[PDB]
Symmetry: D2
Subunit: 479 residues, 4 copies
């Protein structure tokens, strides 16, 4: 029989025995100890939720969508084998997230090991392999009609994309299965649908996107010699609103100015603790926090725990790291100075991020300062907000259908929908903080910042006339 | 105090004066007017009526004014001011007609083109009638109000000024912020909106993305141009753009739903046909029609959604034309939706031209063999202005903000200071075409006329255009 | 294709073309103009919701449960024909409700026409027949694989029970008895009508619902019980099932039997009785029917809705002046005043026959207190209310079959003692509410004295507020100290 | 100014600067790392929520109730000092919970240190003292008008009851009602309950049937036996019985879930085995064990749910026994549930006898002479007392009520005055038996021992009893 489990977002989920068997392993249960929104918990006290339950929900929704397409269109010949594989992918899709989720792959690893190009997804594939092998799942897969050679490839391919038709796991006549868990074409996937619903529930924000409705009007059609998922013509509006909702959650919560500074402070403490923390891996080899990603037996033991390990330690080697985390407890965080954006079409390249604190201190504001501030006193956090496809409109990469001809796929441009939609689909936000907390240094920091904005032809800080009233009239373009 | 349980706002407390206003025919009337008119016939959850919206707006008006008072005693907001703001909120939609916006938005403009009449003007008149016919003036005095000054203040909250120095007679400039609570003429950020977002969502089955409670926590009165106004905190600017997005989104999904609108036009049509033969007893026994009941409030008190069922259940042969339209709604033989389109460039369609557009669609000569020719009376063309509440203007350019560092110093925040992902324009037009002939052959023809008419006037390609009229869409160079 | 419709309780419901065809008729759309909770709207301003949308939801849930049983147990051979019939029943199950729902079949018709035994359900069967015939549905049923002879009986049987020991149903055999337990469960009362209105009424009332129907469906299963295939719940759900009936009783206490909701219902009923004689409703062949007699002809009853309230209120006919004055008194909020509530003791049931006589008894009490005003029996209203777990004095859980994880085809019983000592001792009781038609301060004082005395006289329970409202009368009774 | 914080249950809470200052300390932030429902997370995957946010909410609701009583009844002379103190108590009320909340004070400490009588509350008082002293809060309290001598006593008294006629030193008899807000010793109706109902439901995926906001609207202080207490309105008596029903229902479904409890016993077991070899640095560097950290608050500050993962991730061979239990939880090789039963008549099982019950189950001689024999160490018998918070008493008999007609006159309402459908008793016991041997053969045996043991002690028939032990159930005359 089936196992039932009660998620507060999705209700009573049914779990196939194979899924239960995958779930009840150290590699998966690990996700109970990794928070979804990392440092966001330290701003939204509701956001205690962990990857474990996100992972169940993505598994659940993956099943819903593939099973729905099957009932509506038997011609597709979606097998119970295909359904199980899609569920397993959904279930295991975030297996490779590190401590504090996106803080790890987004802030820490890029600083700790700049040579590597590593992502949460690559980790998931590796950790999935480790889960299968270390728990004897392959026999159980066979028992329930799967073919490990073909299907383990298919599952991995659903997660990271491909390791003519680039996939070895399934033929072109089932390409639509690759658009369920992680949609490379346009980004409309069930990972999104779950975390919108889930993050909102815990954050204390209401979610404006109806995934259930999208499933009712979803359908597979032929597009360029390939069978893809298509939405109904009328849903085009709701799809633009899906990406709006996403961007809106990033603005309010995920990229919250203090959430991000807590993430940078935790990252900083990890960098300082890196050298002196050992994690036992395969064959007893010792791995560091930054190197545990190379061996999955070590990475299985690397969770949010590492924060409290550092905090509670008495090792004097970890004193520098422990002091940063103690400063978070007491709430002596680095102070937020302000936010700004580039103008024209000036993109700030990732290569230049290291240099920006130097530039802020280098500004010469025509105002008498109490204190001079060095470049090490500033932090400059650059954030790319987009609709998931850098500068592109993802709706231009969605296929639609009409009531009158439901097998005939079509495109819908932006002009066909509304003039009130966004003009661009990507931008950059630049947040500046100051490590010196006191009244005198904060005043100075504000002057350096608002000047630096004028110097580089950036947008006027929203509060700019208040924080630096002597600097804002200097720029002709701001009047 | 009386407590009452609204499913949106919880247990509301009602002041005795409010209870006394509520328990009158003029107010209880609102129990029999649906919030979303014809929308009930598309969203079966939307059974909710104006009565309960009216209570909630009254409630939120109290919340906001009471909150400003606690946070800023310097404003000297009196318990008299609070009561007046509550009364305005409570009575703000008193003048809605049968099926709410269908009445002031479709019916009255067709039935009586000479008049410029709104739900709000009706509210002021109906408020006056409520006060006089129920002896409220003594009760207002009993609770510290001054009817001369305050009844003006209440009416002014609802419709704006009753006639660039200070236009209000009800309160001085040092209390201008009170006029921004119930119906905000400056920018549109008011508690009417906050209630109906929450309420309509609850009943529609859509989730609401706007947190009014949060906005209240970061609201504050500051001096702006020699006048005390409500200001939001700098950080809320994003949430305010999202407020108007939420609004526009509710209009797109629900309020301007293609079938909701066609049901509204069909009910309006049946009212126009029934107008002449329905009498409503007014003041001194005078007889008023549906279209003329707005002139006398004793008559208008008896004009509700009932009028639909009165027509439907009637046996008078004079009402047969009207009754047949309403019977066609029951059976679901609605006028068929052909498609939607928009103008291009910045070519605005003037209101004067709306009458002429069915003629233009029939006048199109599509290069396709048609089974049926269709006359202009067979088409309906519904033009809809979607905006952020201030025609072509960005309402956030008319909001004052404040910073944590200087909370009495008001500032402005432009669009460029916030995000490049915000809208370029703040108004547009949608043109929906329907066909009165329902059959398979006429609908095909209608689609050809429509998609041609779109090409003829350099409008946008209908989303489904390549499917419904595949022989017409390649004709236009601009659509390839 | 399917039609999709967005209910705020259940989400996006799919409607089969046959159902759409049934929905889009005057007989069904009528339900848009009948409120679910009748006079409750005048106490809970959220409760604007109408039968129409309840009806859609019951149709939806009926589909969910039958479709779920089918997937989990193919051996049952549940056909797409069976599924459609169960949906149609669910959809049409409340078709026969009158103006203000339960006020009509529960208060008005019993007073207006005491000779008749009539219910909302009997009306539904009749109105279903009328819907089918007047809209040519029978051809459409055949088109989608139904057999009108057999299936229209099956649908009617789902609604009212048997149209009349052996197997009592003609619509389906004993090997599909479980289908009769979905829409209206005669065995124990666990049905999808309940599940929808809990969720729906709560949503609109502003009360939260403590019952998870989705969960019950996941652990539902058909087993053999006494040579008959019935729905069974899992052993562990027994607690949640007792809580289902608790939730029901709790909704009745808070909302449905609210003291003022009920007085508004009696006042509207009263106004209908006074308007009855002078309101004509055109029926079949032009014949004239009254409000009380429209139940006899469905073409008339199709036009009888909540409208009738506003028809009376807005009228100028002097024949309707008595009725119109009652409804105007509701607008102004001059309602009959609530005096208090009480219960019988021991095991003294008050028979329905005696309800007429109780106002006489209250006025007949001789309270040992100086009164300014004497009150006659016509001044009092006494409303008697039977609260139960749906099966008069019986525990409905004693009529539920259960199954275990270890043996899922073997049905069992679970007694009350096996579950908890904190469950109810009895499963039915009576509440007696007394109101006074005279509103003034002096008459209300008097009414309270008559009432609290009458309670002592008949060995009823002490009113909760009794020591306050009648402090000179409560020490008189030895049993209350 | 005020700090705003967004809790998903209560909305945007305002935090007074003094509260912020208390919140931002190691002793308080500690609560971020303790789960509300301990091992329940391993059954309800929604239940990730921690004490931190419960603590904020209780602080919030404490403010709501005291501030509401103040507005409705100025005669009480509730000061802004009183309000702050009530908030601080609410905020700090669960400061002393251990790893996995109630598992610690309810299972672990009673086994690890049977000599001691220790509770989460006693810990809170001690941890509150430590918080104040180690963070220099006393100056800040004074700055905002508090008097540390009197008020720190008042706060502690709100949490644990009297620290030693009128038993309280923190406030006089004319403010006794303040002691009924955070932790109500009289009847149990407090805001701790109100928060966790709402919160646990939100995260569990169960809906909550209790309206705390409504209760506040109809709450009021009256004189009762020469003392000013909180009273509810007469009509709320039903909703109050339903409050305790809701509580009992949450215990049945979630908190005392058969597997949640077995995971709690397994974690407790692993803690007992790890106790001796885990050192936690305390005050002056002294070494404390898990069981002894309760004696020194500097040590206890570092004792959180972490300790689970510390054991799990360790390589010390001294911790191998403990680490193996926790690894068995990961793999889901939990001790197997055999069944549940209750006593009959009025046979209470005394706490003294709990140790002996596994012996009794193995000692049963079922007449199906068994192919594997099981020893007493193979069985776990978990006894659970379900009540309405006051052992065998009806807590509604300890609530004072008032009537609309005389709102200062307090009264009592008995059970008979309300309903015959209420509970007969207000306490009972549940006995769950599990078996440590997991295999098919031992589980069969365990079931026979159990169902016999039930017959032997005249307990209730297990629900599944006829299925699991069909040879044993006809033996007992009383079960047919
Ligand atoms: N909504 C709700 N969820 C519940 C309830 N009880 C448990 N859950 C949640 C907790 C879990 O998330 C899920 C399963 O709990 P079980 O139904 O008790 N199933 P298990 O494996 O214990 O027993 P078996 O092997 O006997 O089937 O439902 C309840 O009454 N209500
Ligand atoms: N959530 C909830 N709302 C309720 C409940 N009971 C009533 N309401 C709703 C219905 C209404 O919206 C509101 C008032 O109903 P009452 O508090 O019962 N007040 P009334 O005027 O009858 O009592 P009096 O004159 O004796 O003061 O509460 C309940 O138990 N729960
Ligand atoms: N949640 C939600 N409900 C919606 C939305 N739009 C409509 N509804 C609700 C209202 C209705 O209950 C239902 C159907 O609305 P349509 O999807 O517009 N379908 P119709 O028959 O008009 O179009 P066709 O024949 O072209 O498919 O969904 C929306 O964006 N969101
Ligand atoms: N619903 C909602 N909650 C939000 C939002 N933004 C933050 N929160 C939540 C997160 C927090 O729980 C709370 C406050 O976050 P901030 O209002 O951003 N205040 P902070 O102290 O950063 O700014 P300052 O010191 O300048 O006043 O609201 C939002 O847009 N919406
Ligand atoms: Fe994910
Ligand atoms: Fe309004
Ligand atoms: Fe029903
Ligand atoms: Fe607590």
């Amino acid at each position: 029989t089936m196992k039932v489990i009660n998620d507060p977002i999705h209700g009573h989920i049914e779990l196939h025995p194979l899924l239960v068997r995958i779930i009840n392993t150290p590699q998966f249960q690990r996700l109970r100890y990794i928070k979804q929104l990392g440092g966001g918990y330290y701003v939204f006290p509701g956001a205690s939720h962990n990857r474990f339950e996100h992972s169940l929900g993505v598994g659940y929704l993956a099943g819903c969508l593939v099973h729905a397409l099957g009932e509506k269109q038997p011609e597709l010949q979606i097998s119970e084998r295909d359904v199980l594989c899609v569920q397993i992918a959904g279930l295991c899709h975030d297996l490779g997230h590190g401590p504090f989720s996106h803080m790890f792959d987004g802030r820490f690893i890029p600083l700790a090991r700049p040579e590597v190009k590593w992502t949460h997804e690559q980790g998931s594939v590796m950790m999935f392999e480790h889960l299968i092998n270390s728990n004897g799942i392959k026999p159980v897969m066979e028992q329930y009609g799967l073919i490990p050679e073909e299907d383990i490839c298919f599952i991995k391919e659903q997660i990271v994309g491909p390791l003519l038709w680039p996939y070895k796991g399934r033929p072109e006549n089932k390409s639509f299965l690759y658009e369920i868990v992680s949609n490379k074409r346009n980004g409309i996937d069930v990972d999104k649908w779950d975390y919108f619903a889930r993050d909102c529930h815990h954050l204390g924000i209401q979610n404006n996107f109806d995934y259930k409705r999208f499933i009712k009007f979803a359908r597979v059609c032929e597009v360029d010699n390939e069978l893809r998922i298509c939405a109904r013509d009328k849903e085009v509006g709701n799809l633009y609103d899906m990406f709006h909702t996403r961007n809106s959650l990033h603005r309010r919560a995920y990229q919250h100015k203090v959430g991000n500074i807590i993430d940078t402070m935790i990252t900083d403490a990890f960098l300082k603790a890196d050298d002196y923390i050992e994690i036992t891996g395969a064959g007893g080899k010792k791995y560091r926090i930054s190197t545990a990603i190379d061996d999955m037996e070590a990475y299985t033991k690397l969770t949010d725990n590492i924060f409290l390990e550092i905090l509670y330690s008495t090792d004097p080697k970890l004193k520098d790291a422990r002091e940063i985390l103690k400063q978070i407890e007491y709430r002596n965080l680095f102070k937020y100075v302000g936010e700004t954006q580039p103008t024209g079409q000036i993109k700030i390249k990732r290569e230049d991020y290291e240099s920006l604190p130097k530039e802020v201190a280098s500004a010469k504001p025509k105002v008498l300062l109490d204190v001079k501030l060095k470049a090490e006193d500033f932090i400059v956090d650059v954030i790319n907000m987009d609709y998931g496809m850098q500068e592109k409109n993802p709706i231009d990469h969605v296929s639609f259908y009409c009531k009158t001809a439901p097998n005939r796929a079509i495109r819908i441009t932006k002009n066909q929908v509304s003039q009130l939609l966004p003009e661009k689909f990507a931008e950059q936000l630049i947040r500046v903080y100051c490590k010196k907390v006191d009244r005198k240094s904060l005043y100075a920091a504000r002057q350096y910042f608002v000047q630096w904005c004028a110097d580089r032809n950036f947008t006027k800080p929203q509060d700019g006339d208040v924080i630096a009233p002597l600097i804002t009239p200097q720029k002709k373009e701001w009047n």
